[PDB]
Amino acid sequence: MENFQKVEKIGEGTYGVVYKARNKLTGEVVALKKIRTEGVPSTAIREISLLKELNHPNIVKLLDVIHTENKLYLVFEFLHQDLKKFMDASALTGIPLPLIKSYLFQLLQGLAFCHSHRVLHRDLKPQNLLINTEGAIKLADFGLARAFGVPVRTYTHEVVTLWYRAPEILLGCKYYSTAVDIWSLGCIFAEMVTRRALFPGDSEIDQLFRIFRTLGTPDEVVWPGVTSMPDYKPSFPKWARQDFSKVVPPLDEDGRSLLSQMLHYDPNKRISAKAALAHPFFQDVTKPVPHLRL
Numbered sequence: 001m002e003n004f005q006k007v008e009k010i011g012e013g014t015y016g017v018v019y020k021a022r023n024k025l026t027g028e029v030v031a032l033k034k035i036r037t038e039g040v041p042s043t044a045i046r047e048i049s050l051l052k053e054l055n056h057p058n059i060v061k062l063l064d065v066i067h068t069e070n071k072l073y074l075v076f077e078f079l080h081q082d083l084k085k086f087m088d089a090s091a092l093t094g095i096p097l098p099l100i101k102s103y104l105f106q107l108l109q110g111l112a113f114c115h116s117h118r119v120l121h122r123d124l125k126p127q128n129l130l131i132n133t134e135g136a137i138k139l140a141d142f143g144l145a146r147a148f149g150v151p152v153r154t155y156t157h158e159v160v161t162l163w164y165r166a167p168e169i170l171l172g173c174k175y176y177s178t179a180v181d182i183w184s185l186g187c188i189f190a191e192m193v194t195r196r197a198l199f200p201g202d203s204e205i206d207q208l209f210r211i212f213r214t215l216g217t218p219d220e221v222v223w224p225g226v227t228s229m230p231d232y233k234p235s236f237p238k239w240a241r242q243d244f245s246k247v248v249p250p251l252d253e254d255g256r257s258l259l260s261q262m263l264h265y266d267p268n269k270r271i272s273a274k275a276a277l278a279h280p281f282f283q284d285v286t287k288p289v290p291h292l293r294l
């Protein structure tokens with residue numbers, strides 16, 4: 001827009017590019033996402049606009065949604081670093097458990113909030129988690145693709161991560177529940193602990209099979225209805241579940257217990273954000289300040 005001064009290009013999210021920009025008028029620094037054959041996604045646009053009322057300390061504030069010149073601009077409050085960069089920067093030492101615990105706790109508070117408002121994120125991943133120098137972490141760029149959907153790339157060639165995708169989505173569910181967000185966050189929690197992506201699939205089937213190899217191929221006993229899912233194949237290999245102590249060493253038992261509930265196959269058995277906040281893993285949670293290099 002003419003009212004903004006592009007500072008730098010931040011990310012190449014799907015559907016658009018994200019820029020750091022300054023409001024020529026107010027001088028305020030923001031994150032600006034620019035989106036976009038025709039048709040006018042009036043319905044999608046409505047939904048996106050509803051997100052403006054989402055106000056919570058752990059959700060990135062959406063300041064404005066501007067439709068103009070066959071382009072859609074989303075203006076967000078700016079944060080200085082995402083969790084992906086922080087994890088990469090902390091790869092040699094690892095993130096302190098108290099900090100990991102604080103971030104997980106805050107993100108569950110954020111999800112408990114948006115889920116109570118019937119809002120799903122749908123695409124949680126480290127790049128969509130932003131941190132500041134004060135020790136806060138926030139949920140960014142809600143997808144609610146229940147309106148705009150999802151093609152195959154951003155809009156102009158670029159690989160999309162499947163690493164945090166819930167199994168029900170990979171099996172073609174059609175109707176996601178808030179449980180898909182808990183799954184993605186469990187995957188992120190594991191990654192912060194081990195400093196390695198939990199399920200790094202390079203294709204939908206590889207993603208699904210990496211999940212099966214670790215958690216066991218699901219069946220009707222652990223996930224009623226799984227064999228009737230759209231993309232389920234009786235021909236799927238049958239892997240036995242691995243011992244969990246092998247999955248996230250050296251996470252303590254409270255942590256492993258919580259992770260196991262965030263990773264239940266059955267969406268109905270998977271723990272809710274509200275219940276997770278009450279898990280004993282958070283008994284001694286605090287709010288440490290991270291060492292951020294900006």
Ligand SMILES: Nc1nc(Nc2ccc(S(N)(=O)=O)cc2)sc1C(=O)c1ccc(S(N)(=O)=O)cc1
Pocket residue numbers: 010011012013014016017018031033060076077078079080081082085086127128130140141
């Ligand atoms: N609010 C906000 N702030 C940001 N800043 C920032 C600063 C430094 C770094 S970094 N790689 O550590 O130097 C990364 C981000 S980004 C962002 C978003 O609201 C947003 C919008 C869209 C997407 S998406 N799904 O990728 O399109 C992701 C985040």
